[PDB]
Every structure is written in C-alpha cells, then in structure tokens.
Amino acid sequence: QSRSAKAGLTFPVGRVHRLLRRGNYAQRIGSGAPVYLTAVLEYLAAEILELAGNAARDNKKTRIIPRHLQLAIRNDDELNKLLGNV
Template sequence: MAGGKGNVRKVSGKSKSKVISRSARAGLQLPVGRIHRLLKQRTTSTGRVGATAAVYSAAILEYLTAELLELAGNASKDLKATNAGEGVIPHIHRYLMEKKGQPQPGQMVAPPP
C-alpha cells in the first residue's frame, strides 16, 4: 500500500497515474474485484478463477438486476391507478377561515358607545 496517497500510483519516478478499477474498465457498476474474490472462495482447493470470469459474472448480475428493477418499476406504475384513497384531502380549519372584521373566539369585544 502507498500510505496515504489515495488512488495515485507512481510509475518509475515519472508522472503519476490514477488507479482504474476493473469495474470502471468494464463499464460496470457492480464490484468485479469483490466478485472475483468470492468466486475464488467458492471453488475447489486450488482457488483458480480466470480474470474474465469475474467480469462476465458481474455483467450478468448487473443485467439481471437492471431487468428485475425495470419489471418492478413497471408493475408499480400499473398498480398505482388502483389505489383508491391515495393523496391528501385538503382541509382548512374554520378558525382560520374567519373574516378579518369579525371577532375571533376568546377576544374581548369593546361595547358599542
């Protein structure tokens, strides 16, 4: 680890380059490195998994997740029209609707002269 330098790597004393994750290289949102690690844990005693296997697995999982979310969104849109009592019914209290010239409850009214 390059203590405290973040995602910057020094290349033989020349300019510094940013570290690009395998997820970013593949254009995926799911973590390819984590999936690769988990695949290695699940295999036999040798634990050998190809580098592209993790990328392919991450792409499949991301595609299936996107499809599932799209179907769930469409279903929720379709069910939205069947909610009978949704929304807020407007209600203004009578106390707030009184005229400006009329006395409000609890106020002292001056007797007529």
C-alpha cells in the same frame, strides 16, 4: 480506476472475483470470469428492476414494494422459470 469501471459495469467486479475465489469452485479463476459474471448479474438485476419498477409505476407508486417484485417475476415467463415465485 476499478475493474468495474474498466468493464463499464456498476456491479462490483472485485467483490465477485473474491466470492469466486473464496468459494473454491476451481483451483484458479481466470481474470475474465468475474468480469463476465458481474455483467450477467448486473443484467439480471437490471431486468428485474425494470419490470418491478414497471409494476410499481403501473400501480401509481414511486417505491418498489415486495408485491411489485412478486408480480413482475410472476408475469415474466423467463424470470418466473428462473426464480420460481416470491
């Protein structure tokens, strides 16, 4: 059982842990830190996918193309603030 599965996550806890360790952000990385961060990244990805997917489906499409992403982000105040513009 992977750490991701242990935490109920789809995003990769192990990979995120190694990215944290390898980036030398601190002397040590606590075992909870990559689990928390992974969950946050998965959440943000899920939010963006939801809204881009909405934009695609609103456009009678079944495949997200970059204009769907651009519009999803632009039309969401908080994601627009977070991610600038695409």
